[PDB]
Design a protein around this ligand. Structure first.
Ligand SMILES: [Hg+2]
Ligand SMILES: [Hg+2]
Ligand SMILES: [Hg+2]
Ligand SMILES: [Hg+2]
Ligand SMILES: [Hg+2]
Ligand SMILES: [Hg+2]
Ligand SMILES: [Hg+2]
Ligand SMILES: [Hg+2]
Lengths: 125, 125
């Protein structure tokens, strides 16, 4: 069902995985989903949460958001792609505020906490 | 401001322009925004509105939906990209039933009207 999202995440680069999980973590499973799926991700906190030097953190998010934006998750039947979907449909780079804005697709934002719960369950150490 | 959608609607190929127009019809001024953002387009109903060799209508609709999906509406500031966005975030290929389903981005719907405007602003006959 939603395992596909979990499948697709395996194929993402390290920082892309981070970006998505970091966004997930900013969601409150108890309350409603973010308006239109918008979530802001600051470099400093990203750089702290993972072990990165904040001095270059923004560059990292920039590249990461851009790679995510370019992802194309597809479904096939035989050799033909039958369905195409994006993780995000909108990205705002804000080097001034040191953050990036991500608009997660309608069909995506509802599975983010599910992803978060999954990554947590394999967090052994 | 939202004059970038018209300025970007230039980049689309004729069919793409048609897709965005066709999917701009199935909306009302009385009634609010569509059913979420999804609009189904039939290859038959396509040749009817635009006159096409109904024999290859679907394949056209396909190529067009794919290209629209690959467009990158982006803005520049001082030569660097500062914002990226997609016309659509989801596509379903239902060749078996001669049609494609298109998920229009939340940032695109509030303009499928203002867009439909200008498009007829070039009609003379
Ligand atoms: Hg985070
Ligand atoms: Hg977490
Ligand atoms: Hg910010
Ligand atoms: Hg979903
Ligand atoms: Hg139409
Ligand atoms: Hg129209
Ligand atoms: Hg159909
Ligand atoms: Hg808009």
């Amino acid at each position: 069902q939603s395992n596909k999202l979990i499948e697709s995440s395996h194929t993402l680069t390290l920082n892309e995985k981070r970006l998505v999980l970091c966004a997930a973590s900013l969601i409150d499973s108890r309350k409603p989903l973010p308006k239109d799926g918008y979530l802001t991700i600051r470099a400093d906190t990203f750089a702290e949460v993972f072990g990165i030097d904040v001095k270059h953190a923004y560059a990292a998010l920039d590249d990461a958001a851009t790679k995510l934006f370019n992802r194309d998750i597809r479904r096939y039947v035989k050799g033909k792609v039958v369905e195409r979907m994006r993780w995000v449909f909108h990205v705002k780079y804000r080097e001034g505020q040191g953050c990036v804005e991500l608009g997660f697709s309608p069909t995506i934002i509802p599975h983010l906490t599910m992803l978060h719960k999954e990554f947590t369950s394999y967090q052994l150490k």
